[PDB]
Structure 1
Amino acid sequence: RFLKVKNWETDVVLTDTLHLKSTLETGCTEHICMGSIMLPVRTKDQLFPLAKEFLDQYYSSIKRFGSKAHMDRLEEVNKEIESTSTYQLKDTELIYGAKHAWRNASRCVGRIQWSKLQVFDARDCTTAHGMFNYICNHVKYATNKGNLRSAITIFPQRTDGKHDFRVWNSQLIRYAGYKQPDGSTLGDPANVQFTEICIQQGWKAPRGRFDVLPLLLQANGNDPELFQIPPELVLEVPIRHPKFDWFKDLGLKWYGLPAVSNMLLEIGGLEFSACPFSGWYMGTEIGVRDYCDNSRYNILEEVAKKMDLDMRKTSSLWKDQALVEINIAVLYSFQSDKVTIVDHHSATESFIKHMENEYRCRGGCPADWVWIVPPMSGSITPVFHQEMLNYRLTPSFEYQPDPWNTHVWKG
């Protein structure tokens, strides 16, 4: 079967065949679409088909499908599963697997970059201190003094689910949030719960607006341990505006390295519960979401006050005007400090070229429109006008619940 998608701006029609390789469920049915819902141990039995499907994909990718090496590896993995109940990936397979999880990540607008990914194999890690060292090296490598390089660090896979490696932080670098007795929040309101956990675990909180959180690291199912990232490894950018000299005195800054650390990487049926990965920012992540969400730093009012906008009616579009200036400021600040960043126009235009290439060479590109369209100026980006098909391919990144909800405290 063939599914078609149309671009309503160009009339370009693309044909998807890749969706035929999708196995997992979307949340949608013939009767209900869950496209805007954020959240819509294996037996030997379920594991070998998953392993075989992956190894088949891997061996096809290297043009060795059906070779003796391919058949030998199937046999090897089969024997390993029957005897030890799991199996280990070759380094080559792990690299291919991590690259493909990114390539398959339907919510990721940055996927033109997918084949350029530095994979740090941390499967020999055994302790939280060991995890800390690996994560420091990842941060330093990926940061590269502002010339950011995409990377992922992969810690040992799940075994019985009682020995999980987990990074408790949702991102390697984030700022603390402190709920005040008067109900106001200091710093990032998104990180209040996690900040409270770190404090409980013994973190001495500076209690300012931009305190870099410590890492909370769980190795081998043990209780998590606290570590502070060396400050000299945390590259930050003070935010200023090219025309407005008062913008700097808002006191804003942000970190240069966006690094997701709470997702689960599935490759060949194996589950990597700790697999922090990083790229570089699209400006709107910071200027639209982190700064302007009512739920986050919420700076729109203060910015519009300083611009002397007419704020007595929403129809002056004061929020929209202030929003644009804040995003100009973020991009300008990053560019001026020589820290990699991409604007939403550039990123979406590159995504469309990536997606067309994928349709030609792969027969599709699963994409989640709700996430791919930027949170400002949607329809002046080419992705707004592009029909997309969302489906789930493996290898994959999956959301997993926060560890504090499920962790068995050892004491």
Structure 2
Amino acid sequence: FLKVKNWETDVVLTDTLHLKSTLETGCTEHICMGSIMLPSQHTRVATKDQLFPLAKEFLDQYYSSIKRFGSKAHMDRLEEVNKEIESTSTYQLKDTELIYGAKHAWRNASRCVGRIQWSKLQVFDARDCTTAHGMFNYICNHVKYATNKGNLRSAITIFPQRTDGKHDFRVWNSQLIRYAGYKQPDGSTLGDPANVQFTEICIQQGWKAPRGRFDVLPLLLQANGNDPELFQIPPELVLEVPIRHPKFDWFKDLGLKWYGLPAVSNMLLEIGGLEFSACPFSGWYMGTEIGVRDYCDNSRYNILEEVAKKMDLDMRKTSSLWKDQALVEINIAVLYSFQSDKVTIVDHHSATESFIKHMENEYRCRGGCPADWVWIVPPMSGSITPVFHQEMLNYRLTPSFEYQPDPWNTHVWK
């Protein structure tokens, strides 16, 4: 029955939810791995034995959540999936069970700061899909829907669950919308250094690249374990926001822009023991992910160099904080540009206040809220946001999202 304090308002909350926790963290009594990026307990193959308690555990919380726990409709659902796990050695989720499982994967994502919106998520059932073209069609309707003309809406599309393991549905993109990265002759990088491998994989499969900076990549969609195929999202569906500053008329000249929709596609959704290897999900951007991480990371776009140049800053001495100075202007510019186009974006102050507010109801109407401090605190201005001063308990509940290996290091190609 542990306690977590906020050393800015002296607020104290009581976490009992951590007792329902199941998966492991990576920490022991004699070591803490809270700062390891991809721990082995966060990454993803299961059999028929363990598959039933996982179903039982899930079904029990789903009926506990509709004030119908243990009743007749529960006990028959229990025996029906029990029976079907005898028969098939797997089972199929109801439409309502999929919506619940998906929404609570988000709820349980301790590194997500946006989770105040977990209840308002739009679940698209793509479990009837059979072909890469079909996947492309479900994904286009996802992007159009979630984008909603800049009035962004939260959504997730769920392709059929893993079974044998070799007939797996996988989006090979890490996000549906990403800018291509190209290496140069001198080794330098054009576009986005992150994707330079993925960009070559797409050109390996015949992508004619318009070798520039902000080139939207094609989708690589793998259907039922078949070799993936290229598909180009209709440009009218990819909404982009050109970045301008509300003081600097030279800020246009920089020529930066960013896509409206953050939409992660390489993750695995885990419900009741069932594994959905493809399940792209989208929301809206917090400003810092673009303005701080995308733009100013060393091995990303890396623009602090030039923003300080046009600002004419003390770029000789480290202790002038010219980097800090150029970084705050870039984020004011991101926020302003997205806002002036009615494209949904949230600032790191408002999102961290909302999270503390979210954390409040989670400890009351639920008894806790798993949170990963290392990831919740924004990557700039840490301590002026209220989450820096809030203690958080991290633990692994299910349903959940997990990392998985990349398909090109596993897919038996042919």
TM-score (norm 1): 0.99
Deviation at 1:16, TM superposition (A): 0.5
Q: Structure 1, residues 84-105: CA drift from partner, whole Å, max 9, x if none?
A: 0100000000000000000000
Deviation at 1:78, TM superposition (A): 0.3
Deviation at 1:285, TM superposition (A): 0.3
Deviation at 1:250, TM superposition (A): 0.6
Q: Structure 1, residues 259-298: CA drift from partner, whole Å, max 9, x if none?
A: 0000000000000000000000000000000000011000
Unaligned runs of 5+ in 1: none
Q: Distance in 2 between matches of 1:125 and 1:211?
A: 28
Q: Distance in 1 between matches of 2:406 and 2:245?
A: 37
Deviation at 1:337, TM superposition (A): 0.6
- Which range is displaced more, 86-95 or 306-315? 306-315
Helix, strand or coil at the partner of 1:271? strand
Q: Structure 1, residues 41-93: CA drift from partner, whole Å, max 9, x if none?
A: 32221000000000000000011001100000000000000110100000000
Deviation at 1:344, TM superposition (A): 0.2
Give the 4+ runs in structure 1 shifted more than 3 A. none
Deviation at 1:346, TM superposition (A): 0.2
Q: Distance in 2 between matches of 1:90 and 1:114?
A: 20
Q: Residue in 1 aligned with 2:222?
A: 218
Q: Distance in 1 between matches of 2:19 and 2:185?
A: 54
Deviation at 1:181, TM superposition (A): 1.5
Q: Distance in 1 between matches of 2:356 and 2:412?
A: 45
Q: Distance in 2 between matches of 1:108 and 1:381?
A: 16
Q: Residue in 1 aligned with 2:27?
A: 28
Identity among equivalent positions (%) equals 100
Q: Structure 1, residues 383-411: CA drift from partner, whole Å, max 9, x if none?
A: 0000000000000000111111111013x
Q: Structure 1, residues 286-325: CA drift from partner, whole Å, max 9, x if none?
A: 0000000011000001000111111111111100000000
Q: Distance in 2 between matches of 1:239 and 1:305?
A: 18
Q: Distance in 2 between matches of 1:231 and 1:312?
A: 42
Q: Distance in 2 between matches of 1:7 and 1:327?
A: 27
Helix, strand or coil at the partner of 1:83? helix
Q: Residue in 1 aligned with 2:167?
A: 163
Helix, strand or coil at the partner of 1:327? helix
Q: Distance in 2 between matches of 1:377 and 1:346?
A: 13
Q: Distance in 1 between matches of 2:340 and 2:20?
A: 44
Helix, strand or coil at the partner of 2:269? strand
Q: Distance in 1 between matches of 2:296 and 2:48?
A: 48
Q: Residue in 2 aligned with 1:347?
A: 351
Helix, strand or coil at the partner of 2:394? coil
Deviation at 1:327, TM superposition (A): 0.2
Note the aligned Cα RMSD (angstroms): 0.5
Helix, strand or coil at the partner of 2:230? strand
Deviation at 1:115, TM superposition (A): 0.2
Deviation at 1:338, TM superposition (A): 0.6
Q: Residue in 2 aligned with 1:99?
A: 103
Q: Residue in 1 aligned with 2:42?
A: none
Q: Structure 1, residues 169-213: CA drift from partner, whole Å, max 9, x if none?
A: 000000000011101000000000000000000110000100000
Helix, strand or coil at the partner of 2:50? helix
Q: Distance in 2 between matches of 1:26 and 1:334?
A: 37
Q: Distance in 1 between matches of 2:318 and 2:14?
A: 42
Q: Structure 1, residues 123-174: CA drift from partner, whole Å, max 9, x if none?
A: 0000000000000000000000000000000000000101000000000000
Helix, strand or coil at the partner of 2:315? coil
Deviation at 1:336, TM superposition (A): 0.3
Unaligned runs of 5+ in 2: 40-44
Q: Structure 1, residues 357-408: CA drift from partner, whole Å, max 9, x if none?
A: 1001100000000000000000000000000000000000001111111110
Q: Distance in 1 between matches of 2:114 and 2:261?
A: 15
Q: Residue in 2 aligned with 1:326?
A: 330
Q: Which residue, 302, 308, 312 being the options, matches 1:308?
A: 312
Report 1:113-128 matches (<5 A).
113-128=117-132
Helix, strand or coil at the partner of 1:217? strand
Q: Structure 1, residues 226-251: CA drift from partner, whole Å, max 9, x if none?
A: 10000000000000000001011111
Q: Distance in 2 between matches of 1:301 and 1:208?
A: 20
Q: Distance in 1 between matches of 2:293 and 2:48?
A: 43
Helix, strand or coil at the partner of 1:212? coil
Q: Distance in 1 between matches of 2:66 and 2:171?
A: 33
Helix, strand or coil at the partner of 1:325? helix
Helix, strand or coil at the partner of 2:393? coil
Report how many aligned residue pairs link the two structures: 409
Deviation at 1:32, TM superposition (A): 0.8
Q: Distance in 2 between matches of 1:328 and 1:405?
A: 40
Q: Distance in 2 between matches of 1:242 and 1:403?
A: 43
Q: Distance in 1 between matches of 2:165 and 2:62?
A: 26
Q: Which residue, 146, 149, 158 being the options, matches 1:145?
A: 149
Q: Distance in 1 between matches of 2:37 and 2:137?
A: 33
Q: Distance in 1 between matches of 2:183 and 2:48?
A: 47
Q: Distance in 1 between matches of 2:194 and 2:248?
A: 28
Helix, strand or coil at the partner of 1:242? coil
The reply to whether residue 288 of structure 1 matches residue 292 of structure 2 is yes
Q: Distance in 2 between matches of 1:45 and 1:263?
A: 25
Q: Distance in 1 between matches of 2:177 and 2:406?
A: 17
Deviation at 1:342, TM superposition (A): 0.1
Q: Distance in 2 between matches of 1:349 and 1:282?
A: 13
Q: Distance in 2 between matches of 1:74 and 1:296?
A: 49
Helix, strand or coil at the partner of 2:330? helix
Helix, strand or coil at the partner of 1:5? strand
Q: Residue in 2 aligned with 1:16?
A: 15
Q: Distance in 1 between matches of 2:164 and 2:46?
A: 9
Deviation at 1:39, TM superposition (A): 1.0
